Amino acid sequence: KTLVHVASVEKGRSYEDFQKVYNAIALKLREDDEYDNYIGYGPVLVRLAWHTSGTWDKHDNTGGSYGGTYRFKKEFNDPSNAGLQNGFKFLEPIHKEFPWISSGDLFSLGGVTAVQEMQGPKIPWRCGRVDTPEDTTPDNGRLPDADKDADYVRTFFQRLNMNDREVVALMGAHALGKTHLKNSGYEGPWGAANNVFTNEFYLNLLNEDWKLEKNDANNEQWDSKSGYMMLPTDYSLIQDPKYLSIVKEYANDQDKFFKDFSKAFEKLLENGITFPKDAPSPFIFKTLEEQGL
Numbered sequence: 438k439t440l441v442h443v444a445s446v447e448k449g450r451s452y453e454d455f456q457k458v459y460n461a462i463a464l465k466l467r468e469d470d471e472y473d474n475y476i477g478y479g480p481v482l483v484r485l486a487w488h489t490s491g492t493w494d495k496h497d498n499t500g501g502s503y504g505g506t507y508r509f510k511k512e513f514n515d516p517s518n519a520g521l522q523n524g525f526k527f528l529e530p531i532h533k534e535f536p537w538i539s540s541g542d543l544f545s546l547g548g549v550t551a552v553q554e555m556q557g558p559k560i561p562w563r564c565g566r567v568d569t570p571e572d573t574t575p576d577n578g579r580l581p582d583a584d585k586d587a588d589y590v591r592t593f594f595q596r597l598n599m600n601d602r603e604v605v606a607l608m609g610a611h612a613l614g615k616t617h618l619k620n621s622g623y624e625g626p627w628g629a630a631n632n633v634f635t636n637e638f639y640l641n642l643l644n645e646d647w648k649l650e651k652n653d654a655n656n657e658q659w660d661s662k663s664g665y666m667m668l669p670t671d672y673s674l675i676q677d678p679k680y681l682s683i684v685k686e687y688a689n690d691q692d693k694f695f696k697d698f699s700k701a702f703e704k705l706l707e708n709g710i711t712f713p714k715d716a717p718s719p720f721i722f723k724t725l726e727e728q729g730l
């Protein structure tokens with residue numbers, strides 16, 4: 438048994454309307470550049486898009502991006518989501534200016550906007566997520582643990598209908614931002630260019646000299662002398678021979694990584710949603726830079 442969630446376009450809206458929302462997000466990203474010691478809000482908005490989508494369960498179609506349920510306190514206060522309140526606060530003035538967009542559409546568009554504005558690939562995006570009631574909020578515990586191994590990771594993502602290539606591609610988002618000890622019990626960035634979307638995550642996995650250390654929360658993480666870290670689950674991508682081949686591919690082919698990430702990220706954001714056959718095609722938003730804005 439699975440619920441059906443049919444996409445329904447916000448009434449009367451079309452590409453131009455959502456490009457305006459895109460633009461407002463992008464301009465605020467530019468404006469509020471001081472966030473997180475000048476990393477900016479790009480990374481936390483990408484994380485917010487993933488965590489609001491990553492509760493999905495293919496078996497019964499519970500969770501997922503459609504209902505926008507992070508706005509309800511059970512999901513907002515998931516310990517897995519610690520730190521994401523910053524993303525939500527960023528989006529509040531956006532939602533205030535454009536109150537017609539659904540919460541799910543906003544959270545997922547925030548992630549697309551962030552990736553593109555950080556020079557990542559275009560991510561086609563579809564509208565029509567519809568807010569669902571508080572009792573549809575999925576319980577805590579559907580997001581993954583970081584202390585585990587490759588078998589955990591593989592098994593975890595089966596629940597989101599992601600294969601090895603999809604998983605390795607999605608994990609490349611760890612180029613962005615950092616772990617924060619008070620949020621997750623891990624500390625440090627994965628790389629140097631952490632508000633520009635690149636394939637740095639894979640290059641660092643393969644080329645840094647990693648040491649297994651304990652951080653100040655008494656948790657193990659892999660650290661390099663350049664001041665970078667990897668979670669146990671990140672490092673698992675080079676411990677497993679199947680993941681390791683894919684890491685090598687993306688480390689050696691920027692374009693391939695961009696294309697595969699774009700597909701997997703859109704899929705993650707669309708899991709659980711039925712698009713009517715007459716739905717609009719996916720939108721590909723222009724960046725501020727492409728618009729001369």
Ligand code: HEM
Pocket residue numbers: 480481483484487519520581582583584590607608610611613614615616617618620621622623668670
């Ligand atoms: C095994 C799967 C994953 C695990 C265990 C995991 C774990 C974590 C942890 C522990 C943090 C640090 C949070 C903090 O302390 O602030 C984090 C941050 C982050 N995650 Fe992942 N993650 C996974 C997959 C993903 C995926 C699939 C994406 C997106 C496609 C993603 C995007 C990010 C981003 C952008 C940040 C940085 C946020 C910031 O700097 O505020 N993660 N993740």
